[PDB]
Design a protein around this nucleic acid. Structure first.
Ligand SMILES: [Mg+2]
Ligand SMILES: [Zn+2]
Ligand SMILES: [Zn+2]
Ligand SMILES: [Zn+2]
Lengths: 107, 654, 112, 171, 10, 166, 87, 97, 267
DNA sequence: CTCATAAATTGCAAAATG
RNA sequence: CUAAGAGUAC
DNA sequence: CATTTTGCAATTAGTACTCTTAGCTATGAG
């Protein structure tokens, strides 16, 4: 994770994607002053393992696209370091049932 | 009689596959080439052969069968013709798309500008959906203006790899009306990109290139976006004075003949260009007359021509005016009036409307006698029958059939008869903003000219009686009847999913009356008690012991009203400041179906959550709740009739 | 969090005039609007752009343009939507149509 | 030649036909329609194997119809002619244009152009036959013929045969 | 674009 | 796929393009793949006889050429009803051109041709045509060219001709 | 079809007949009764095909099965006999 | 009387699919049109009394099907084909859900 | 616009809420799988009241005197006191109730106790009381073990999802957790024995009725919840410092970058 | 003398510079 | 018959 | 390396009723 003060030069963004499996993630200090995940609006996000994703798609008979989508630019997706194809489990305090579990696939 | 039997297998459409007509497909499917712009021959009594109304595309007269399929106008789908255009023209709907495609492929060698050697092409081609692929490819290759006969190597930017590029420079392409003009960089060279050269360059696009652009090998290739053989819809599409499409096709044929003669006889290039532009304009206005910038193709009467796009789009187009919503038979509409003596799920149907709207009932050993009697009665008295459909498909109308004598009905036939009592009929008040505004009622035939519905059931419909009109739809099969009665029945709709509370209640006079009836001061003598008890249809037949026995037997209003409330209902609401004793008689306590205390008013019998309606329907069922509606309205309306309630100017005076 | 805010906005709209709508209706609305990862508006530029079938996309707005784009892209419409089966005049796979009714010969014989 | 293949047929049953003998009705109605029939896709169809328990499946009520649409799957024995296949047969008729040979359920017409120059028609004989220098082809005569051309029709499959090749003729 | 959906441009 | 129109090579036994649905492997009604077996004339006759006697027994509970023809005619008339003209012609064609009598000989033939490890169409044609020599078999069935050795084919047709009876 | 058909031993749907299932069962059965289908229940004088279907369903004498389609295309076969009509 | 869009929507919310189909097909316009399985277009010449179905171009006479669609739908498809769009109608699934 | 947007949403047979494409909108309808028409407003007693009041209402101790029980409440009122097994059962039951109290206080920041839930327990309790003629003076026939095991078994019997794997079981527990919290709030041993004074047959009948009503309130697969929601939102719109009503509904559905009155809330 | 033709949303590719 | 227009009902 | 700027049309509650008018005008030529 690279943390910058103000911005990154455009000539530096192009070389940010290095040789795999090394991944570089850029975050702004101003955007990291407040942790978004502690907001009451923000529910609990838990990254799923590959085995868990396979079990999810098996049990719910889903395809990759039939899951709810989460952009690979969402502040929470950047926060937890999601890569495309990884499914997050969302625990939400519902008002009709106490707990509701959703699943969002990164796109 | 409908349509006669066909031996072709019957299936339901599972997948609708779109695409573009290939010109050879248009030539193959066409049954008659159209060559002359006239519609009728010189005799004016037959359809001209070779004209726009060739009988091979479908007969225009009932007395004549279609020349191709040897079937009448009732059966013939209408078969397409084809006009072989003298020169290719743009499709008006695809011009922009065409532009984009010709902005992505080299205009000389006919190959895509940036193959996978370019950095972003791997990401662009990795996209799955065709539309996003094309969007990325266009937005990346639109700024590239060279075919790049030699490109830097993917391994390293030192050596040069030569691909199948001709090395020319692609132009900047703009649209000037119905044509595309290209400006090549000056070594600018501005020239109109003729449809012939664009069609040529599209026919040179490799399969991989255009399937990466989002096109398909089989269904829609890019070169099919340029028209060379225009399909001619049959006269069924443009019935006849002639239709607007007929005149537009006549104009197209006239322009095509003009250009063809100028080509064959030889002519200056300017006249050829003018004829080509006129042909393009006529084709575009035939397919779209609302082109921005260009003037509308006006009709012979001075009005804009109705193009096909105009026929499709809009509220009155095909989709929204004839497919999403369409005019239907077996429906009535008239003024609505209230009737406190009707059940909640009942609707009053005028005798005339019942005599008009009909239901087909299949002849069964169980209903042979009654349908036979209805047939004997005929269609001019109610109840009766209007038609008999035999197993052979022949229809017997009860009018003019009495001469042939009585009809011996056979099992399996249909008797199409007047809608009678207890027929599930969909009842609707428009705009019909929710599902409760369209509910299944039971027919009660009445001897007057208005629809009659319970006062409560007006609340879901948002219906008054100051001139409102309502619609009545009759199912024409046992399946639709059954699911209408078992899913759309009014009692099943009492509790709305809209707010998990009842949508109907006691309203208007009854509500006022019930408040006046359940006051502590309200005491009822023996005779009025007997009448009110009898007015409850499901009264158990035992007179409750009066609230006061000596010196005069007086029943309170709460005691009599508790007869309407079904046995076994417990309700306990505490209003503002009420105690277990009620100094203000507010609140509500009902124990085992007897109103222990509380004035019965809007909060109790109205459409409120936790009220009497909700409790009754959740405990005993929707049918018992409808029965409760009827009983409460009956008893309260009788009491208010014999008590009276008015209002005047003095009521507004302090 | 955007979906939660959208539900709160819709609920405040519903409750401004004192009316009450069940939670699950507004929850379905906000979940449909945010099932694509972003706030999909209820507009011709919003839900109508999703690749959900040309015949039902055109039934709302921009009919002829949708038909042209489907023809150009050779779209395959699977006729799963309500509007597709409404247009083609066939029982939509909804409500009573969300299943198939078939016949058991063995049970019919076992009855008698 | 003779093969056995999987076939599927869609049968529609009226509401009045649903009784304890529905399976018997479906089994009988599969017969009389495909037994000994002919189609262009699979040639002739002679009989159905394993009649003890044929796969009938469940059926499906057509909405607003009530008639059930069964998709009955079965094993059918077929005789599909193929191009360039040698097969024995029996001559049943002769004419100027050629002669007909009985192969299974079908008749193959060998034209007069497809016999050696020595063989010639002879109508003087009763019945008329084909006489050559070394052999004669008459009625009810065994003959081996190679099919070299087939036209695919549904109600009646047609094949074109010949005996011009070596070791083709009367056995 | 257009208008609607000037140009581009102008 | 759903390719509109269809371009296909002409059916040719020598080229072994029996058809797109006449390939070696076919998915059965159980969902698995089985080889496309081809029944020779004697084997097909025996299969038809077994099916017809099974049908006759089910309905009941619910050799020389002349006597065999009489028996098959009686059984066919007893088992099925009408539209059997094609079935009768095929049955008499099979009985007349019957290369084998009973189950043991046809089983021996089919297991020998399986041990040859050859195509089912080709082995069925070999069991159907009463060939004598090796080059004769090669010229009768072009598909056998450059597939099997001369001596092995000659000897196996020798045993096949030996197994011919009546 | 074999891959699609979920075996009876592991059907994961509700054993209770839904309102839509009951509505369609009643509609189909009433239609068949109207078209002279055999009746498996004794009649106490009823003549309406709909109430005939209701009486048939009351004692589970309807010879039909629901084929409930999962969103993936897989289906479960629930015989009307083993479905419990609670509503 | 008009069975408008939102009336259809109310019948959808009620879940009565067969009643909606009856409203939009039997009560208004039910049209039997023929197509071929090769090309899903309605370019099938039908001779019902002579029992001959033939789609010219595809060179087929046994790969035909009949479908029941509203005449408005047939007219829409005809105007689409007249406008160089092929709404091919296929009676089997070429893809999984 | 709302109807067209939501026209293809449907509850499928696996209880998920999917559109025409098969995309999952909700993994269970309404996040609890309940039909909207079968929902009534009820009070959650665990969340309300004070810690001392909650203890007095629910805390049961067989070893002390501050939170003991009257022996006349039940048949074995003088035998249970001093026991260890039933004290363990009450200890875990009260710990579960404390957990429910904390959970519900977490779910609702404002502590609102009246919320819409499928099955109305109060009406069933009153029906049993009026059917079995509870006299409120006779010692109860029930035993504590019966009450605890019956409540636990009833919670196990409320099935929304019938699947047979860990994901489906977790989803089922998540779907029924709030209704189970309500059920424990109402059918507590203290409340059953003292406030309501259920008998043995009456308790069994209450359990059976709760199970039946909950299984009856589950949403029906094939339900067109999309059009239902669209109409249920649009119908109140017709009856209609910060913009509200129809203009605000338009501002929300048409997700507009610029809106008339953008206001921000800071705590 | 009669037939034939003259509010509010969206949706950007240029063109210029220093 | 079609199209356009005007007025009107809820 | 950093901005920057610009020009506008299509689509937008349901049904339902009644009545009124008009359908290329004028000129050439066989
Ligand atoms: Mg009014
Ligand atoms: Zn025709
Ligand atoms: Zn080039
Ligand atoms: Zn075709």
């Amino acid at each position: 994770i690279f943390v910058y003060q103000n911005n990154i030069t455009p000539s530096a963004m192009k070389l940010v994607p290095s040789i795999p499996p090394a991944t570089i993630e850029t975050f702004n200090e101003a955007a990291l002053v407040v942790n978004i995940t502690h907001h009451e609006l923000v529910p609990k996000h838990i990254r799923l393992s590959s085995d868990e994703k396979r079990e999810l798609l098996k049990r719910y008979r889903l395809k990759e696209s039939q899951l709810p989508r989460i952009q690979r630019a969402d502040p929470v997706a950047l926060y937890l370091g999601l890569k495309r194809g990884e499914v997050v489990k969302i625990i939400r305090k519902s008002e009709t049932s106490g707990r509701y579990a959703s699943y969002r696939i990164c796109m | 009689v409908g349509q006669q039997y066909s031996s072709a297998p019957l299936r339901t459409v599972k997948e609708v596959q779109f695409g573009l007509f290939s010109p050879e497909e248009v030539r193959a499917i066409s049954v008659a080439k159209i060559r002359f712009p006239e519609t009728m021959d010189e005799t004016q009594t037959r359809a001209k052969i070779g004209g726009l109304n060739d009988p091979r595309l479908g007969s225009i007269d009932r007395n004549l069968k279609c020349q191709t399929c040897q079937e009448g106008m009732n059966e013939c789908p209408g078969h397409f013709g084809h006009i072989d255009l003298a020169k290719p023209v743009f499709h008006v709907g695809f011009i922009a798309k065409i532009k984009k495609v010709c902005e992505c492929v080299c205009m000389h060698c006919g190959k895509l500008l940036l193959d996978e050697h370019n950095e972003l092409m791997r990401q662009a081609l990795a996209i799955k959906d065709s539309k996003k692929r094309f969007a990325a490819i266009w937005t990346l290759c639109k700024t590239k203006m060279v075919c790049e006969t030699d490109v830097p190597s993917e391994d390293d930017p030192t050596q040069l790899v030569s691909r199948g590029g001709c090395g020319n420079t692609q132009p900047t392409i703009r649209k000037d009306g119905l044509k595309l003009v290209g400006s090549w960089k000056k070594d600018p060279e501005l020239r109109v990109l003729s449809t012939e050269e664009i069609l040529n360059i599209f026919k040179h696009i490799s399969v991989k290139d255009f399937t990466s652009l989002g096109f398909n090998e089989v269904f829609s290739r890019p070169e099919w976006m340029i028209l060379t053989c225009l399909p001619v819809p049959p006269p069924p599409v443009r019935p006849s004075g002639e239709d607007d499409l007929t005149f537009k096709l006549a104009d197209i044929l006239k322009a095509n003949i003009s250009l063809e003669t100028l080509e064959h006889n030889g002519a200056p290039h300017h006249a050829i260009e003018e004829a080509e532009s006129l042909l393009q304009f006529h084709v575009a206005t035939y397919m779209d007359n609302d082109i921005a910038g260009q003037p509308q193709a006006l009709q012979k009467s001075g009005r804009p021509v109705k193009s096909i796009r105009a026929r499709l789009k809009g509220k009155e187009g095909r989709i929204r005016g004839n497919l999403m919503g369409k005019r239907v038979d077996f429906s009535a509409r008239t003024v609505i009036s209230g009737d406190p003596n009707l059940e909640l799920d009942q609707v009053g149907v005028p005798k005339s409307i019942a005599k008009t709207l009909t239901y087909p009932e299949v002849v069964t050993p169980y209903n042979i006698d009654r349908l036979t009697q209805l047939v004997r009665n005929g269609p001019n008295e109610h109840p009766g029958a209007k038609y008999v459909i035999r197993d052979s498909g022949d229809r017997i109308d009860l009018r003019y059939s009495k001469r042939a004598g009585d009809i011996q009905l056979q099992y399996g036939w249909k008797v199409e008869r007047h809608i009678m009592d207890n027929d599930p009929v969909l009842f609707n008040r428009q705009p019909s903003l929710h599902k409760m505004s369209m509910m299944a009622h039971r027919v009660k035939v009445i001897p007057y000219s208005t629809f009659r519905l319970n006062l409560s059931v007006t609340s879901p419909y948002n219906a008054d009686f100051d001139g409102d009109e309502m619609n009545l739809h009759v199912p024409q099969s046992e399946e639709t009847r059954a699911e209408l009665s078992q899913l759309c029945a009014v009692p099943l709709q009492i509790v709305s999913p809209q707010s998990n509370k009842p949508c109907m209640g006691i309203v208007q006079d009854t509500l006022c009356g019930i408040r006046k009836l359940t006051l502590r001061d309200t005491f009822i003598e023996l005779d009025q008690v007997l009448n009110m008890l009898y007015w409850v249809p499901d009264w158990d037949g035992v007179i409750p012991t009066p609230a006061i026995i000596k010196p005069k037997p007086l029943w309170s209003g709460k005691q009599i009203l508790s007869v309407a409330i079904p046995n076994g209902i417990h309700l306990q609401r505490f209003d503002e400041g009420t105690t277990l004793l009620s100094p203000k008689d507010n609140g509500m306590l009902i124990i085992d179906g007897q109103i222990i205390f509380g004035v019965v008013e809007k909060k109790t019998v109205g459409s409120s959550n936790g009220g009497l309606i909700h409790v009754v329907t959740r405990e005993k069922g929707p049918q018992v709740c409808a029965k409760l509606f009827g009983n409460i309205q009956k008893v309260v309306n009788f009491w208010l009739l014999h008590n009276g309630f008015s209002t005047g100017i003095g009521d507004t005076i302090a | 969090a955007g979906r939660a805010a959208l539900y709160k906005e819709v609920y405040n709209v519903i409750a401004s005039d004192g009316s009450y709508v069940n939670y699950r209706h507004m929850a379905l609305l906000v979940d449909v609007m945010t099932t694509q990862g972003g706030l999909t508006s209820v507009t011709r530029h919003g839900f109508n752009r999703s690749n959900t079938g040309a015949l039902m996309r055109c039934s709302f707005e921009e009919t002829v343009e949708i038909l042209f784009e489907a023809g150009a892209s050779a779209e395959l419409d699977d006729c799963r939507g309500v509007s597709e089966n409404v247009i083609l005049g066939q029982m939509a796979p909804i409500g009573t149509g969300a299943f198939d009714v078939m016949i058991d010969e063995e049970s019919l014989v076992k009855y008698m | 030649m003779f093969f056995i293949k999987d076939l599927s047929l869609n049968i529609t049953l009226h509401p009045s036909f649903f009784g304890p003998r529905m399976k018997q009705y479906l089994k009988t109605k599969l017969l009389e329609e495909v037994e000994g029939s002919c189609t262009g896709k699979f040639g002739y169809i002679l009989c159905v194997l394993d009649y003890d328990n044929i796969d009938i499946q469940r059926g499906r009520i057509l909405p607003t119809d009530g008639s059930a649409e069964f998709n009955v799957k079965y094993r059918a024995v077929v005789f599909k002619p193929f191009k360039g296949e040698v097969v024995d047969g029996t001559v049943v008729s002769c004419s100027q244009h050629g002669f007909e040979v009985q192969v299974g359920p079908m008749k193959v017409f060998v034209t007069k152009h497809l016999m050696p120059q020595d063989l010639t028609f002879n109508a003087g004989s009763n019945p008329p036959s084909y006489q050559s220098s070394e052999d004669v082809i008459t009625i009810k005569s065994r003959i081996r013929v190679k099919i070299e051309g087939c036209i695919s029709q549904v109600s009646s499959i047609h094949a074109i045969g010949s005996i011009k090749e070596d070791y083709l003729g009367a056995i | 674009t257009x208008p609607g959906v000037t140009x581009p441009g102008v | 796929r759903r390719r509109l129109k269809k371009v296909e090579e002409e059916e040719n036994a020598a080229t072994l393009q029996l058809g797109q649905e006449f390939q070696l492997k076919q998915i059965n009604h159980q969902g698995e793949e089985e080889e496309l077996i081809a029944l020779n004339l004697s084997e097909a006759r025996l299969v038809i006889k077994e099916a017809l006697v099974e049908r006759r027994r089910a309905f009941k509970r619910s050799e020389t050429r002349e006597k065999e023809l009489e028996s098959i005619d009686v059984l066919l008339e007893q088992t099925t009803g009408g539209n059997n003209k094609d079935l009768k012609n095929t049955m008499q064609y099979l009985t007349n051109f019957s290369r084998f009598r009973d189950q043991e000989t046809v089983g021996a033939v089919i297991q020998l041709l399986k041990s040859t490890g050859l195509h089912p169409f080709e082995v069925a044609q070999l069991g159907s045509l009463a060939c004598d020599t090796a080059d004769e078999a090669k010229t009768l069935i072009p598909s056998l060219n450059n597939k099997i050795s001369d001596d092995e084919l000659e000897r196996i047709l020798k045993e096949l001709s030996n197994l011919e009876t009546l | 079809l074999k891959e699609k058909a979920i075996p009876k031993d592991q059907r994961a749907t509700t054993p209770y007949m839904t309102k839509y299932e009951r509505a369609r069962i009643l509609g189909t059965r009433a239609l068949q009764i109207s078209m002279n289908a055999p009746v498996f229940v004794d009649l106490e004088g009823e003549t309406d095909p709909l109430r005939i279907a209701m009486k048939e369903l009351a004692e589970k004498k309807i010879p039909l099965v629901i084929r409930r389609y999962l969103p993936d295309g897989s289906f479960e076969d629930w015989s009307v006999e083993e479905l419990i009509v609670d509503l | 009387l008009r069975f408008g869009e939102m009336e259809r929507d109310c019948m959808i919310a009620h879940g009565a699919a067969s009643f909606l189909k009856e409203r939009l097909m039997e009560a208004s316009d039910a049209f039997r049109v023929h197509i071929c399985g090769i090309c899903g277009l309605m370019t099938v010449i039908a001779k019902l009394n002579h029992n001959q179905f033939e789609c010219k171009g595809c060179d087929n006479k046994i790969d035909i099907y009949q479908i029941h669609i509203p005449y408005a739908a047939k007219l829409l498809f005809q105007e689409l084909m007249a406008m160089n769009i092929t709404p091919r109608l296929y009676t089997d699934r070429s893809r999984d859900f | 616009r709302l109807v067209k947007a939501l026209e293809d949403i449907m509850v499928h047979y696996d209880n998920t809420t999917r559109n025409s494409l098969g995309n999952v909108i909700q993994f269970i309808y309404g996040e609890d799988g309940m039909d909207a028409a079968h929902i009534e407003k009820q009070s959650l007693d665990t969340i309300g009241g004070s810690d001392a009041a909650f203890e007095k209402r629910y805390r049961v101790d067989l070893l002390n005197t501050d939170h003991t029980l009257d022996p006349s409440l039940l048949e074995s009122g003088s035998e249970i006191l001093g026991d260890l097994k039933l004290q363990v059962l009450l200890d875990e039951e009260y710990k579960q109730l404390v957990k429910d109290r904390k959970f519900l206080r977490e779910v609702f920041v404002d502590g609102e106790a009246n919320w819409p839930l499928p099955v109305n327990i109060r009406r069933i309790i009153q029906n049993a009381q009026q059917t079995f003629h509870i006299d409120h003076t006779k010692p109860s026939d029930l035993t504590i073990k019966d009450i605890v095991l019956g409540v636990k078994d009833l919670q196990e019997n409320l099935l929304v999802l019938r699947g047979k794997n860990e994901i489906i079981q977790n989803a089922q527990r998540d779907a029924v957790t709030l209704f189970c919290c309500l059920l424990r709030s109402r059918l507590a041993t203290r409340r059953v024995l003292q406030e309501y004074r259920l008998t043995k047959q009456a308790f069994d009948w209450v359990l059976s009725n709760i199970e039946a009503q909950f299984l009856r309130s589950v949403v029906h697969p094939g339900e067109m919840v999309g059009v239902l929601a669209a109409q249920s939102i649009g119908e109140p719109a017709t009856q209609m410092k910060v913009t509200s009503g129809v203009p605000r509904l338009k501002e929300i559905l048409n997700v507009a970058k610029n809106m008339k009155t953008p206001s921000l809330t800071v705590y």
